[PDB]
């Protein structure tokens, strides 16, 4: 049974994104409490947020298999981390975020668009900074 | 121009669901180099990762207008956050996780259906846990 292709992959990616979200989402939801006072409560969306990390990596390590989720590309060493990032980095930057600024203007969302660019000129940031690092690579 | 049914809500949730797995990716690239020993690597996807969460979160305080991605149910209280917790979660233990524990073993992969089981007794475990949380909360 090869992973690539299955449905399994599929799920596995699913499963990742759902877990990446829980994490984010727990997070937000602790810092809510955090204001509110609700320590404990706060303290649980922390704990249980730890679980979601250990999961989607759970899910992230079987995706060696098949390749990173965010482009296609493999990953693992240093190397091709930098560089899967990279080319997701620049999708967002050249792509995605441009694109999704253009759409909220367009349907009357100006401070969603001016956050899309915000977010446009941050992941180009981030993948100039990528690049470097990986022309710093020593492996 | 109101959000709920928008393109923009709907980037706002692809978006929400990329910059999460991008903090989840990054910090499994970090924990790669860690062990590599590219310690500056690691740091510089560990800072990276901290952009992530702040782009995450900043997606979805905008979806507070239109309810939690997971789970379409409304959140900004702890009341709130754990009702839509709570009703993730039970999706997740009663339907995703079983529903791909199923496919993985039907399509031959027993030790990824055994992983899956694991994190539907898990997400039941979180679902619980925050069960109770919501029974002792006073606000």
């Known amino acids: 049974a090869q992973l690539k292709g299955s449905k399994t992959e599929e799920n596995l990616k ?3 994104a759902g877990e990446s979200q829980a994490n ?9 409490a955090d204001v509110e ?16 990390t250990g999961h989607a990596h759970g899910h992230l390590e079987y995706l060696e298999a098949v390749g990173d989720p965010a482009t296609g590309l493999p990953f693992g060493t240093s190397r091709q981390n930098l560089q899967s990032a990279i080319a997701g ?5 050249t792509d995605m975020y441009p ?6 203007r367009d349907e009357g969302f100006e401070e969603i668009a001016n956050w899309f660019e915000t977010l446009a000129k941050a992941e ?6 990528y690049t470097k690092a990986l ?3 020593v492996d």
């Not at 984010?24 to 809510?32: D, E, I, T, V, W």
């Not at 980095?89 to 930057?93: D, G, K, R, S």
């Not at 180009?124 to 900074?129: D, F, K, L, P, T």
């Open 14 to 16: 699913y499963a990742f």
């Open 24 to 32: 984010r989402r727990y997070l937000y939801f602790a810092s809510k």
């Open 37 to 52: 006072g609700q320590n404990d409560i706060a303290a649980l969306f922390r704990s249980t947020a730890e679980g979601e």
């Open 89 to 93: 980095e620049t999708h967002e930057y």
């Open 99 to 104: 694109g999704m600024a253009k759409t909220a």
């Open 124 to 129: 180009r940031s981030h993948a100039n900074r």
């Open 135 to 137: 022309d710093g690579l």
